Amino acid sequence: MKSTFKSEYPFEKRKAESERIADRFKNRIPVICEKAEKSDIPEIDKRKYLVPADLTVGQFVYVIRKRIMLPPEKAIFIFVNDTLPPTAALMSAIYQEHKDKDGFLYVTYSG
Amino acid sequence: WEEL
Numbered sequence: 001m002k003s004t005f006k007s008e009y010p011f012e013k014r015k016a017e018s019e020r021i022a023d024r025f026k027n028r029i030p031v032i033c034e035k036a037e038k039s040d041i042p043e044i045d046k047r048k049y050l051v052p053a054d055l056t057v058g059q060f061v062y063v064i065r066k067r068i069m070l071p072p073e074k075a076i077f078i079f080v081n082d083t084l085p086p087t088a089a090l091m092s093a094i095y096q097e098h099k100d101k102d103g104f105l106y107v108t109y110s111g
Numbered sequence: 112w113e114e115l
Contacts, residue, residue: 050114
């Protein structure tokens with residue numbers, strides 16, 4: 001049994017969120033950021049992020065970093081459907097290309 | 112939610 005975001009809320013309730021957000025926030029992309037299933041680094045229970053269209057991967061990664069007090073020495077990586085996007089990539093671009101049918105964009109992190 |  002999974003302990004993810006999809007597994008915690010049903011499709012219909014998830015999409016409900018996507019829409020209210022796309023409604024009450026014009027320039028924001030709703031992101032679900034979860035820890036890589038078999039990764040070792042710390043797991044945060046805060047996974048819902050409202051990100052600006054111009055936010056970059058590199059910047060998003062920096063955020064998750066501080067959030068889980070990652071030793072700058074240690075590494076962390078963000079994935080979008082098995083794809084490791086380049087740090088210059090803008091989240092808006094990634095959203096158009098990979099948003100889930102529920103309305104969210106699912107990202108994953110690890111080391 | 113967290114606004115980044």
